[PDB]
Amino acid sequence: SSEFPFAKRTVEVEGATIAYVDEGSGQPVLFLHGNPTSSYLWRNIIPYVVAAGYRAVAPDLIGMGDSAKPDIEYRLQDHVAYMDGFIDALGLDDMVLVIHDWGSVIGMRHARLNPDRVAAVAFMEALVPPALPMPSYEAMGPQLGPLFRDLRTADVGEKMVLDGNFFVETILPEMGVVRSLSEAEMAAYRAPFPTRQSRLPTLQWPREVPIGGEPAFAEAEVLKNGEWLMASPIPKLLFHAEPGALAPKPVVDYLSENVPNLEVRFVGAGTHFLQEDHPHLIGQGIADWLRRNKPHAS
């Protein structure tokens, strides 16, 4: 359950190494994680799509998991270039996306710009309207608001994240998961981030969240993704939890009434990293949804 019974493969993308899980055969299901996780996040979900007869492909984002740590800024722009390049390197086509957090932004953008290549999209705790973009820190509540302001403040964020590893050591196990992560699980999540410098991607990601218009690029991407989501005819699947974080009940209710061709699966108690609290419901869910829809790209 904390076990990771997958070998990883490596491929060169834009001069750097991307590590990835590659299991099964045939139609690809591409799993995209966010901050501060890796392909490890999907370890208990992957076996469900493989047994359903699909090829499970789960890369580690650049600078994360077992992927390379190049001297780059790790902005949204950077991450999309490596993931698009990864898709190209593997020649992935007729894709089902399974996406979370910043992975949802990268994933939806890819579907948006390549509608001929994406069969279907499963997502959860996504950075997408109506919840995103955020108008202000105040709009995030008395906990997340000041926390993200801190992360986005010079010196403060560096001390918290680079020196303290706060995203990995606190936000992930304490705020983002209902159950207690085991020692083996925490070891896996901290393994890519033993040094100050290595932690940069976990600091840059909260600095990418579009709040009060900043930064402009991520804001534009999230808004255009929202337009794609409301207009796209392709089969979609949403997992959500109570109370949730990016997607509380009223956000889900809105999405369920307005997104075309959307299946919604409540998983019970959870906040953000739903895969840790309900991997089997999520796994069974994706497989069942694929069995009924058999989605293919036009």
Ligand SMILES: [Cl-]
């Ligand atoms: Cl983040």
Ligand SMILES: [Cl-]
């Ligand atoms: Cl479960």
